[PDB]
Amino acid sequence: LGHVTIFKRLAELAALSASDTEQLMQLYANKNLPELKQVCQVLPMGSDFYTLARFGHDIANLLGRLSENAQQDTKIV
């Protein structure tokens, strides 16, 4: 199971460009964790984007690992 809304809301709230969205998506498709970690240090809310790839599998605790702005988004919840 997946859910595209989560990444789309994070992409909205972090005001990502087309370029940056494409790059994260490519990195997600490859589950390239090292290069994702690098790219996420220099992105707004990049911590949340990293969390999706690293801890998304554990859906019971995903909400609690997300940022405050993410946790207060109803659509994400």
- Which residues are near Sr ion by CB under 5 A? 38
Q: Pick from Sr ion, other proteins, none: which does 35 bind, CB < 5 to 8 A by kind?
A: other proteins
Residue 41 to residue 35: CA distance in whole angstroms: 10
Residue whose CB is less far from other proteins, 21 or 32:
32
Shortest distance, position 29 Cβ to Sr ion, whole Å: 19
* CB closer to other proteins out of 32 and 69: 32
Contacts of 49 (CB under 8 A, 6+ apart): 7, 10, 14, 24, 36, 40, 43
